[PDB]
Design an enzyme around this catalytic site. Sequence first.
Site, PDB file in Angstrom:
ATOM      1  N   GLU A   1      47.029 -11.772 -66.409  1.00 41.67           N
ATOM      2  CA  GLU A   1      47.331 -10.554 -67.207  1.00 41.67           C
ATOM      3  C   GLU A   1      47.926  -9.593 -66.482  1.00 41.67           C
ATOM      4  O   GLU A   1      48.683  -8.462 -66.929  1.00 41.67           O
ATOM      5  CB  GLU A   1      45.969  -9.878 -67.737  1.00 41.67           C
ATOM      6  N   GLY A  15      50.883  -9.714 -39.677  1.00 37.34           N
ATOM      7  CA  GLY A  15      51.113  -9.395 -41.283  1.00 37.34           C
ATOM      8  C   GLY A  15      52.189  -9.575 -41.854  1.00 37.34           C
ATOM      9  O   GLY A  15      52.152 -10.199 -43.041  1.00 37.34           O
ATOM     10  N   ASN A  55      41.856   3.588 -44.739  1.00 38.54           N
ATOM     11  CA  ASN A  55      40.983   2.444 -45.162  1.00 38.54           C
ATOM     12  C   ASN A  55      39.980   2.559 -46.362  1.00 38.54           C
ATOM     13  O   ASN A  55      40.034   2.048 -47.189  1.00 38.54           O
ATOM     14  CB  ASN A  55      40.630   1.492 -43.995  1.00 38.54           C
ATOM     15  N   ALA A  79      45.821  -5.202 -40.103  1.00 39.72           N
ATOM     16  CA  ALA A  79      45.783  -4.041 -41.263  1.00 39.72           C
ATOM     17  C   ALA A  79      44.913  -4.605 -42.598  1.00 39.72           C
ATOM     18  O   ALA A  79      43.964  -4.299 -43.004  1.00 39.72           O
ATOM     19  CB  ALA A  79      47.257  -3.601 -41.784  1.00 39.72           C
ATOM     20  N   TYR A  99      42.573   5.119 -39.027  1.00 38.75           N
ATOM     21  CA  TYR A  99      42.556   3.859 -39.792  1.00 38.75           C
ATOM     22  C   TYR A  99      41.231   3.834 -40.701  1.00 38.75           C
ATOM     23  O   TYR A  99      41.534   3.629 -41.877  1.00 38.75           O
ATOM     24  CB  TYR A  99      42.665   2.648 -38.997  1.00 38.75           C
ATOM     25  N   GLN A 109      41.142  -5.179 -41.647  1.00 38.86           N
ATOM     26  CA  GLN A 109      40.528  -3.974 -41.617  1.00 38.86           C
ATOM     27  C   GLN A 109      40.029  -3.241 -42.918  1.00 38.86           C
ATOM     28  O   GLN A 109      38.999  -2.487 -43.214  1.00 38.86           O
ATOM     29  CB  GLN A 109      41.071  -2.679 -40.532  1.00 38.86           C
ATOM     30  N   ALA A 144      51.183 -11.995 -32.366  1.00 39.82           N
ATOM     31  CA  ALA A 144      52.493 -12.265 -32.525  1.00 39.82           C
ATOM     32  C   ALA A 144      53.399 -11.120 -32.009  1.00 39.82           C
ATOM     33  O   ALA A 144      54.620 -11.236 -31.917  1.00 39.82           O
ATOM     34  CB  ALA A 144      52.902 -12.271 -34.098  1.00 39.82           C
TER      35      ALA A 144
HETATM   36  N1  LIG Z   1      46.315   1.303 -43.529  1.00 40.47           N
HETATM   37  C1  LIG Z   1      45.942   0.722 -42.257  1.00 40.47           C
HETATM   38  N2  LIG Z   1      47.173   0.578 -41.646  1.00 40.47           N
HETATM   39  C2  LIG Z   1      47.164  -0.122 -40.493  1.00 40.47           C
HETATM   40  C3  LIG Z   1      45.914  -0.805 -39.970  1.00 40.47           C
HETATM   41  N3  LIG Z   1      46.076  -1.314 -39.141  1.00 40.47           N
HETATM   42  C4  LIG Z   1      47.238  -1.410 -38.513  1.00 40.47           C
HETATM   43  N4  LIG Z   1      48.095  -0.680 -39.750  1.00 40.47           N
HETATM   44  C5  LIG Z   1      49.574  -0.597 -40.039  1.00 40.47           C
HETATM   45  O1  LIG Z   1      50.166  -1.778 -39.805  1.00 40.47           O
HETATM   46  C6  LIG Z   1      51.447  -1.819 -38.990  1.00 40.47           C
HETATM   47  C7  LIG Z   1      51.200  -2.665 -37.871  1.00 40.47           C
HETATM   48  O2  LIG Z   1      50.706  -3.990 -38.303  1.00 40.47           O
HETATM   49  P1  LIG Z   1      49.370  -4.730 -37.632  1.00 40.47           P
HETATM   50  O3  LIG Z   1      48.509  -5.216 -39.007  1.00 40.47           O
HETATM   51  O4  LIG Z   1      48.675  -3.630 -36.921  1.00 40.47           O
HETATM   52  O5  LIG Z   1      49.670  -5.760 -36.870  1.00 40.47           O
HETATM   53  P2  LIG Z   1      49.120  -7.465 -37.094  1.00 40.47           P
HETATM   54  O6  LIG Z   1      49.227  -7.900 -38.416  1.00 40.47           O
HETATM   55  O7  LIG Z   1      47.733  -7.512 -36.220  1.00 40.47           O
HETATM   56  O8  LIG Z   1      50.330  -8.330 -36.269  1.00 40.47           O
HETATM   57  P3  LIG Z   1      50.426  -8.356 -34.621  1.00 40.47           P
HETATM   58  O9  LIG Z   1      49.467  -7.657 -34.101  1.00 40.47           O
HETATM   59  O10 LIG Z   1      52.045  -7.904 -34.383  1.00 40.47           O
HETATM   60  O11 LIG Z   1      50.412  -9.857 -34.327  1.00 40.47           O
HETATM   61  C8  LIG Z   1      51.571  -0.543 -38.612  1.00 40.47           C
HETATM   62  O12 LIG Z   1      52.614   0.206 -39.548  1.00 40.47           O
HETATM   63  C9  LIG Z   1      50.219   0.398 -38.609  1.00 40.47           C
HETATM   64  O13 LIG Z   1      50.485   1.691 -39.399  1.00 40.47           O
HETATM   65  C10 LIG Z   1      44.825  -0.239 -40.806  1.00 40.47           C
HETATM   66  O14 LIG Z   1      43.341  -0.421 -40.568  1.00 40.47           O
HETATM   67  N5  LIG Z   1      44.975   0.558 -42.041  1.00 40.47           N
END
Ligand SMILES: Nc1nc2c(ncn2[C@@H]2O[C@H](COP(=O)(O)OP(=O)(O)OP(=O)(O)O)[C@@H](O)[C@H]2O)c(=O)[nH]1
Lengths: 334, 427, 437, 54
Positions: free
Chosen positions: C254, C146, C228, C12, C224, C15, C99
């Site tokens: 600030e 994340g 995004n 997330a 996504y 991206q 993870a």
């Molecule tokens: N807005 C948005 N949400 C995202 C995106 N990719 C994943 N998510 C959200 O993030 C959550 C999952 O986390 P990710 O970031 O995919 O997982 P990660 O941090 O890569 O961790 P692991 O894959 O578990 O090691 C879910 O709730 C998804 O809906 C994105 O490009 N945009």
Amino acid sequence: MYTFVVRDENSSVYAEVSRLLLATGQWKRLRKDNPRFNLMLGERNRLPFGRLGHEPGLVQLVNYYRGADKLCRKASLVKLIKTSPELSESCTWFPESYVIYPTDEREVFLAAYNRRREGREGNVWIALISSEASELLDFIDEQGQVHVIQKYLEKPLLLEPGHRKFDIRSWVLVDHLYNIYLYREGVLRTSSEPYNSANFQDKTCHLTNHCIQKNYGRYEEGNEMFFEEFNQYLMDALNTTLENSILLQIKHIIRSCLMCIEPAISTKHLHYQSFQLFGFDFMVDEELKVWLIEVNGAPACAQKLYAELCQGIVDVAISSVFPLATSIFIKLHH
Amino acid sequence: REIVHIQAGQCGNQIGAKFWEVISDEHGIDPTGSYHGDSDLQLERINVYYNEATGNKYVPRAILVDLEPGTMDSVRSGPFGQIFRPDNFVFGQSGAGNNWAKGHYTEGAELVDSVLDVVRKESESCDCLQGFQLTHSLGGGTGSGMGTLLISKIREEYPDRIMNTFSVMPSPKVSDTVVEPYNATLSVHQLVENTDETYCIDNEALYDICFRTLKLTTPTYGDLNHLVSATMSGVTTCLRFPGQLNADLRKLAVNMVPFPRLHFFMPGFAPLTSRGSQQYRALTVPELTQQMFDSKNMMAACDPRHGRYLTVAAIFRGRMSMKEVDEQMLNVQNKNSSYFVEWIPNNVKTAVCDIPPRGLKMSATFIGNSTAIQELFKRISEQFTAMFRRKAFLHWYTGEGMDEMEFTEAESNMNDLVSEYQQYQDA
Amino acid sequence: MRECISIHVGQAGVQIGNACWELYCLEHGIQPDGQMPSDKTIGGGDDSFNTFFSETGAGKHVPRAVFVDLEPTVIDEVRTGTYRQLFHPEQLITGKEDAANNYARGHYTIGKEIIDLVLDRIRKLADQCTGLQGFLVFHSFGGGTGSGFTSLLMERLSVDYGKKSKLEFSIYPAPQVSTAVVEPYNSILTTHTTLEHSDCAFMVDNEAIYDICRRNLDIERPTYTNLNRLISQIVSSITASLRFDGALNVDLTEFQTNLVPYPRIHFPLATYAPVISAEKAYHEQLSVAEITNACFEPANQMVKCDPRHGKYMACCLLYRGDVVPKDVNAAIATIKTKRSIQFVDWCPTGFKVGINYQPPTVVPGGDLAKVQRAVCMLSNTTAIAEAWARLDHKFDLMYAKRAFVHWYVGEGMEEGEFSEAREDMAALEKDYEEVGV
Amino acid sequence: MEVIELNKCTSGQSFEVILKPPSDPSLEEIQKKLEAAEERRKYQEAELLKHLAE
Ligand SMILES: Nc1nc2c(ncn2[C@@H]2O[C@H](COP(=O)(O)OP(=O)(O)OP(=O)(O)O)[C@@H](O)[C@H]2O)c(=O)[nH]1
Ligand SMILES: Nc1nc2c(ncn2[C@@H]2O[C@H](COP(=O)(O)OP(=O)(O)O)[C@@H](O)[C@H]2O)c(=O)[nH]1
Ligand SMILES: COc1ccc(N(C)c2nc(C)nc3ccccc23)cc1
Ligand SMILES: [Ca+2]
Ligand SMILES: [Mg+2]
Ligand SMILES: [Mg+2]
């Protein structure tokens, strides 16, 4: 098949609604903690509004308006009338009222008490009813909780035969579109023992509550006079109808109260929807002038009318959002 | 992220060969190992199941195991037999004679070291190994006894890797020997402890689908294996193909298994097809969603209405409206909310792959961790106790060194699993 | 001029980082190769954009950005994508195995092996700064990397860069687009570990962004990329004051001063208007009054909640386009009398306003239309606690049965940490209650 | 109503409008927590390998 949940067991109104909903065969009741519902018949206290409207693929509806307690608590209603420009301090359908805390507007209350004293006019107040200010204030601190000191209506309209006091209860349903529906049938909760002007200690003839009365059942069954009998009485005794003398003022107060709070409580653009049934409580004086006493967040119906009102709640509040595969309400136009 | 595939015994090798036959067709690989497909979406994660040989020839990461030479010769002379690496064929001579003890303790112990040498040789090529998937039956001797011996040894050498199995359950309706409930109970006891994920492929259910739904009045093993390979293709789709959900074996385990022991999955498939006859009317999205959740489509002979769903994973294959998929998937959950646990929020997840399987325009595959799977384990337990209370046929096992105590322990652990599944049905 | 380093963690984070940096480039007129024709001082300088971009002698403008994922696949798309020349290889850190949606695996197991490498690469960018002011961290609440790795990094940054400010851009989990059933666990766990280490955090509920895309952009099933591109527009509005000449929110300190009087209540609600579809033929352009009015509709918020049943502690209006102060004050006067805006008794009932005359830049061939004027409102309302209530309830339902807990314990984490994290959240829900009624 | 702190430039302008007046763990502690978690992982793997040794 629509789905609902019940979170108030003590609710005599929504027990009949949940009964009626199942009876159609197009509604299924789920367990208390199931999130996947179309309808919620929620709890009186601590209702989790923040959890509503977050189930994808489900239109959600609740039987309470968030924020509508500001009209339904006694302390809040006084504050709302006094501060909101739509109602203003000079409200003429609301009795002079003040907010008092136990050890605030105490000095503001006593300034009005002295104008009544030095004017040598009727100086009787309610909290329990007394004529002396220093005996009222001592009762408030003795209780513990916050209370409102309100002007007591010394010259009420009195039913004959009997010389009896009364109050009117009106049932009002606000839908999801904020249409204000007044149920055509109201009830007069009557005193059964004559109104005594001199003795304020006698709480039986001064308070018209369904519990305190329970001479009970002398003139009418269960101390409840309905709208047809009260209209008939006014025609014979005073040469006027209920519609003109009383009901226009009732329709005015209901509409003014709910128009005021509309921007704060409306669910017009929200992710969840609300409706609510209210109980407006009215006092009539001898000059046929209507005064608002309290508003009820969780009102109880009268036995004769349970069947009709609960079908009306299903018809215009529930079925309007969730349709199935003459109207008993008067719409108050705005 | 590489997967090592192992197939053990007659059943394991037969359903295993069919698996590689079906998934090679989806990835566009001919029997020689050459790529003759058009879409690049086929090759993006081909390294999951295939090793890239010199000369650009693909090779399945597959180890073929048996104590008998008979079935592996059928694989070698079969349709896709030439694609398998000839060294990865590990066989004994005398067989296991439908005996768990022979597979686990005597005959299989002789051969298990040779298999593990091939396992290690495949594992060392791997950039990042996910773990292992085994195909086997629980009713025989090799797949049942030696298969569970392999798992236990693989867990010792690779304790930080995932163990996935496709386990075929025995039924009296499709029966080789009377001793199958003994072999299965001894196996289940091992699977409860040593696997992360088990797909319960019930032979009873495969028979009933063939008889009641597919209208085949006397079904062979080939008719049964057709349903297995179609399910096996479906359940591995999100491992084989790039999507929004980049799925691996561990992620499936984390999200599907709320409690370590309760890792037995009930697979499902829609629409149900038989070999030869092609169905011409394509199914709409509401039809797929209604079928895949129906007990007639389940590969395990359980009635989901007799239990509750802990977690669900649903994979839709083909070109369709993803909005309609989302709408239909939410429709099933909302209309049947009592059959999904309230204490796991949003326990149904859905994925879409654009590539359909052979002979279908669109299809649906179902992976369910239902508490209703206890019915399968109760059935095996009831058939077990009928023989064991009289210690019948037990001499085949005591002759190979096993004590009666080991049967009592294995009976006990499965009965524990049953009441453990029962626990979450009510609270 | 004081530099800011952007850190993008997990799928997330990365991206969204792609989306934000593509947008920043178009706004400052920086091309995919790194050249900036409008920039006259070659090989250095201390202009407002130099907060986010450093300069090489060749004329290349490189982001002060570090991308970290425990898995190669997502950053590999950055490495080969249209903006490959923009970042230098060392800024892009990837692991072997992710993870697996597990906080504990991200924080403890796989986190431990990569934490020292990441901080070293952060040090390489920090040593290029003449006066580093702090960090902008992009991540999901729900992912394993994340949630897990982010909270370990947030702990370590407080040690190495203790005098610096840390801002979060966090993705709140939504069932509509979620990838994992255990996302409420990950969310509560990361919030507890990060709370003391973050100075201001902008929450973005994927549910809100998803519905905005359906309702306002006419996208049937938002990807996504759709989400995004919208999220980046909101992020750009928040960061504009660091990247452009102005007098409001010029530095990271600030943001804390203007939006966060209570250190723990550091989650401001973002609201953005207008979101207009690109392939909508004929659109009547909305005025200052209309777009400011849309800032108080819940359907335009980044988190679905009701500000009317809460109290405000701070409020910022960030306008972009044809907007003058006179129009803003007139809009505020009308809105005040028509709506329920209740401030806390210990705060001025007021608005801090920033206008930038350059209208919002949209990605060519995007889903979003070119508008004459746009606005982002940042408000610290107690109403955002509704999102905490939702998340805590989901946590409680799963934890009562100890569902999935064994996966976390198996990575070395203790069962006590779950209930410790839940207690902190109960305290946080209580903080909003004291301030809000 | 009252419009204060008005600051203008070529890029834009900023101001404030008031409507109404009012009425960390160290590096040693982090390395300890992470390694305590590794000891619990190693113990659980050792108890597994001991069980498989049986
Ligand atoms: N807005 C948005 N949400 C995202 C995106 N990719 C994943 N998510 C959200 O993030 C959550 C999952 O986390 P990710 O970031 O995919 O997982 P990660 O941090 O890569 O961790 P692991 O894959 O578990 O090691 C879910 O709730 C998804 O809906 C994105 O490009 N945009
Ligand atoms: N579905 C299916 N089941 C099989 C097949 N072959 C054998 N079985 C079942 O597996 C059990 C016997 O195991 P088998 O694999 O023949 O013994 P092994 O070779 O010693 O492992 C019996 O319950 C059979 O019903 C097959 O090709 N397909
Ligand atoms: C109950 O919640 C879940 C369940 C499984 C998943 N994952 C990781 C999936 N893994 C695989 C291999 N296939 C799927 C197919 C379809 C949908 C998901 C998956 C995610 C969430
Ligand atoms: Ca320069
Ligand atoms: Mg056989
Ligand atoms: Mg990831």
